[PDB]
Amino acid sequence: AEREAMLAKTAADNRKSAEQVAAAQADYEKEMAEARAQASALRDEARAAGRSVVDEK
Amino acid sequence: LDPAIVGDEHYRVAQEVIRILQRYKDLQDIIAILGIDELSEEDKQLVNRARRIERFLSQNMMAAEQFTGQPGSTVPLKETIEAFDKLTKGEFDHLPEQAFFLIGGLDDLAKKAESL
Amino acid sequence: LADADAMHAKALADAKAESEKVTEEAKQDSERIAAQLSEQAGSEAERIK
Amino acid sequence: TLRELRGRIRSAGSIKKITKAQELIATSRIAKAQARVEAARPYAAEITNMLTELAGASALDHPLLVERKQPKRAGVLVVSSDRGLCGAYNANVLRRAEELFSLLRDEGKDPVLYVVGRKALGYFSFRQRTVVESWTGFSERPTYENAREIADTLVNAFMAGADDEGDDAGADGILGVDELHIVFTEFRSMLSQTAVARRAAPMEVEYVGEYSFEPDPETLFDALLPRYIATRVYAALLEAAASES
Amino acid sequence: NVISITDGQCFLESDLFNQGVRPAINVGVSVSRVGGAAQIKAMKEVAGSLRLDLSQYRELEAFAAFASDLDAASKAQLDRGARLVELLKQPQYSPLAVEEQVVAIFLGTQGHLDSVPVEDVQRFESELLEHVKASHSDIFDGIRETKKLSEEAEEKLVSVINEFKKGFQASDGSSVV
């Protein structure tokens, strides 16, 4: 009753590291892209608003 | 150009080059659309040799020093005829074609070819 | 298991650094482009004057 | 000039017309080739099922099943067509053959090659290499007899190298081969046709995990394998012809 | 008569304008005899062998229908030619100075945009360009004064390039590595 828990733990560990690193890389990409997209939208809208107010004035 | 003035080897080399280029031009019309797949290998080798000999005639004179930023080159006639006869033997078939573009001599030819 | 949680802190730290630097860069770009655009509008204003 | 131009116009227009006509010829031939290629499936499935059932509880030993102790050499057969105007088909086949020969040269063996088709026949005759035997004149329309005799010849040649030690032929009396290779082309799609090489000379046994034998099971096994080899050989040819068209 | 009387000419053909690229300049016949004193030495060192590369690209693109011959031997050549062709296009009423244009030609020659997909390369450099305008402009003054590319500026600019492109996202959202 104790020689299968060791292999169950081995099976869990063999994939825990891969799952964790995959999730970490996915979150890293998600946050990087989200922040860059936010910055790009902000700069685009600021440039558009500047052009608009300059045209009006 | 006559065998009475110049030795027979030069005459033979010139005649062979002339015939090769003539055959290449003759086949150019057919190859212009279909290509080499329809054509036989006996003429594919001729096509390859004609392309290589045509690309080999390119040279880098010193007058282009104000354009290419490289020195010119000169070759004695004996080396020229020897290299051309060697090429017509077909030994240089293994070498890539682009290496023959704007080369000075056979030593520079080998150096450039083995540099890539 | 102990090593498993090392990268989260540095990941979040670099995320914050990226966020602040890109916000600053966007602010600088917006203010500069507004500055030159407004100055050119004023320039054509005195031109038409 | 003018008349040269007009004559070239006539020649090129006629070439246009007949190229389209013969392309339609090829298109029409595609349909019947695809209809004909797909009729041997039931017999192959039955021969596979019977082989699996027979070898399920049989002894695992056969000269084709076992391997020679020494890699003296390796045979190889490459297929080609009996007509030109195929495009890069011959070029693809020859490139695959050259790549395989280069790969085999790593072991230091001296192979012997067998070729089907007149174009590759001339190509290799022009080059410096021996060809023991060639087959032509029926690549467009094959039959079971050709595949059967070819499989018989290849099996006999493989058997003829059982005791090839050094340069000595032994009791065989003739130098034999210890490995075979097959080169052909597959019909992946109407536009995807990739040349495929396979090795099938020594049989390999794999267990995926988990009747009555009135005659001798070993004799049934021994007679059964050659039929399987012949059916594979026959199945290759229709695939090659379809890819060619 | 006009070609005979003068020296140097430029050829424009309706073909390339039809396929879409607006500046339609032929690369095989259009030549100029003006010597190397026209370029600045910086332009001479940073730009070279472009005409021959474009010519061989135009020759080799004639056999794009047969991949059985190239076989991963000129894939880099084909890709570089495509990226360069996509680079040469110019928008309408878009004045450009020597500084940013020599920057762009250096970037194209070094091939640092190979990872960037073809679909947005243009806008890519634009962002990069304006960032370098927003960022330090010391390198522009440096190459404007000595009229040559100093090496230290080269490491500085490539480091800035790596920093920007690591922070860059593609059109489809795939970061370049």
Curated annotation (Swiss-Prot), chain A:
Coiled coil: none annotated. It is found in: Cell membrane. F-type ATPases have 2 components, F(1) - the catalytic core - and F(0) - the membrane proton channel. F(1) has five subunits: alpha(3), beta(3), gamma(1), delta(1), epsilon(1). F(0) has three main subunits: a(1), b(2) and c(10-14). The alpha and beta chains form an alternating ring which encloses part of the gamma chain. F(1) is attached to F(0) by a central stalk formed by the gamma and epsilon chains, while a peripheral stalk is formed by the delta and b chains. Belongs to the ATPase B chain family. F(1)F(0) ATP synthase produces ATP from ADP in the presence of a proton or sodium gradient. F-type ATPases consist of two structural domains, F(1) containing the extramembraneous catalytic core and F(0) containing the membrane proton channel, linked together by a central stalk and a peripheral stalk. During catalysis, ATP synthesis in the catalytic domain of F(1) is coupled via a rotary mechanism of the central stalk subunits to proton translocation. Component of the F(0) channel, it forms part of the peripheral stalk, linking F(1) to F(0). This is ATP synthase subunit b. The gene is atpF. The chain holds residues 58 to 114 of 170 of the full protein.
UniProtKB/Swiss-Prot annotation, chain C:
It comes from the Bacteria. It is found in: Cell membrane. Binds 2-aminothiazole antibiotics, which are antitubercular agents. In the N-terminal section; belongs to the ATPase B chain family. In the C-terminal section; belongs to the ATPase delta chain family. F-type ATPases have 2 components, F(1) - the catalytic core - and F(0) - the membrane proton channel. F(1) has five subunits: alpha(3), beta(3), gamma(1), delta(1), epsilon(1). F(0) has three main subunits: a(1), b(2) and c(10-14). The alpha and beta chains form an alternating ring which encloses part of the gamma chain. F(1) is attached to F(0) by a central stalk formed by the gamma and epsilon chains, while a peripheral stalk is formed by the delta and b chains. F(1)F(0) ATP synthase produces ATP from ADP in the presence of a proton or sodium gradient. F-type ATPases consist of two structural domains, F(1) containing the extramembraneous catalytic core and F(0) containing the membrane proton channel, linked together by a central stalk and a peripheral stalk. During catalysis, ATP synthesis in the catalytic domain of F(1) is coupled via a rotary mechanism of the central stalk subunits to proton translocation. This is ATP synthase subunit b-delta. It comes from Mycolicibacterium smegmatis (strain ATCC 700084 / mc(2)155). The gene is atpFH. The chain holds residues 51 to 99 of 445 of the full protein.
UniProtKB/Swiss-Prot annotation, chain D:
GO terms for biological process: proton motive force-driven plasma membrane ATP synthesis. It is a peripheral membrane protein. GO terms for cellular component: plasma membrane; proton-transporting ATP synthase complex. Keywords: ATP synthesis, Cell membrane, CF(1), Hydrogen ion transport, Ion transport, Membrane, Transport. It is found in: Cell membrane. One of its GO terms (molecular function) is ATP binding. Coiled coil: none annotated. Belongs to the ATPase gamma chain family. Produces ATP from ADP in the presence of a proton gradient across the membrane. The gamma chain is believed to be important in regulating ATPase activity and the flow of protons through the CF(0) complex. F-type ATPases have 2 components, CF(1) - the catalytic core - and CF(0) - the membrane proton channel. CF(1) has five subunits: alpha(3), beta(3), gamma(1), delta(1), epsilon(1). CF(0) has three main subunits: a, b and c. This is ATP synthase gamma chain. It comes from Mycolicibacterium smegmatis (strain ATCC 700084 / mc(2)155) (Mycobacterium smegmatis). The chain holds residues 4 to 256 of 307 of the full protein.
Curated annotation (Swiss-Prot), chain E:
It comes from the Bacteria. The record marks 30 as: Required for activity. It is found in: Cell membrane. F-type ATPases have 2 components, CF(1) - the catalytic core - and CF(0) - the membrane proton channel. CF(1) has five subunits: alpha(3), beta(3), gamma(1), delta(1), epsilon(1). CF(0) has three main subunits: a(1), b(2) and c(9-12). The alpha and beta chains form an alternating ring which encloses part of the gamma chain. CF(1) is attached to CF(0) by a central stalk formed by the gamma and epsilon chains, while a peripheral stalk is formed by the delta and b chains. Produces ATP from ADP in the presence of a proton gradient across the membrane. The alpha chain is a regulatory subunit. Belongs to the ATPase alpha/beta chains family. This is ATP synthase subunit alpha.
